[PDB]
Amino acid sequence: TYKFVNMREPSMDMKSVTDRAAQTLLWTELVRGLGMTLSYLFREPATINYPFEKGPLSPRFRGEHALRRYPSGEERCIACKLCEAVCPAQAITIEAEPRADGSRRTTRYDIDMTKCIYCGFCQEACPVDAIVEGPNFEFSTETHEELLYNKEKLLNNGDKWEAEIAANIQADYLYR
């Protein structure tokens, strides 16, 4: 089906042309605009008071990455090396090494924030939910260097936002 959008039939009776002349002479349609915006002013605004109040978000939010650890506290990461293999920007660099215990985890988990694109594929890639990416978005900076996150930086951030992301995946893993 379809419908026309500009087939207009201006009736040429003496009545109708009076409105058309009234429209042109007295700026009726322009006055419609004035009363239109006036009604908008007489309405409330919707400007949220940042940072005293921020935008509404969702448990599935993708933000800043943070490596987590088990309830025991050992790092979930086992260097399966899936995340960099799917990482569409190759922002994840990592090299595994033997460990003293034999639970040979990685000596390197460096995610370049200025190369990464926050698809969240790393979360889906990780079979042990080691690399998740938290709800934080305030991690701005002034020098390009501090965005080259390293294994220590992710571990510290994971220990920081651990209170938040733990509940987020708690309320979202059923969907995943």
Binding site: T1, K3, F42, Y175
Partner: protein
Amino acid sequence: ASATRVIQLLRNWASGRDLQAKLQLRYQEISKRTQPPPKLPVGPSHKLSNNYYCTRDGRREAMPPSIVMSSQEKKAVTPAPPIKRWELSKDQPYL
């Protein structure tokens, strides 16, 4: 919402319509952000009875382009029947 009936009248008259019926903002009508856990369904082929992948081989069932003519009375046809002139929208023909 907050707004008194006085300037509600000003918005309604100036806009030519009642705006209290629906507003561009949100209110208690929004579903609360602690929705109960779901129970997402299972796949159609999730049965543990006969489910051999030899049946559904979507990637495998594809075939090379069929050879019909290669370099190495009649009738005239078309790649498809000519299009059908759709009729006007019965809901609203002319804007």
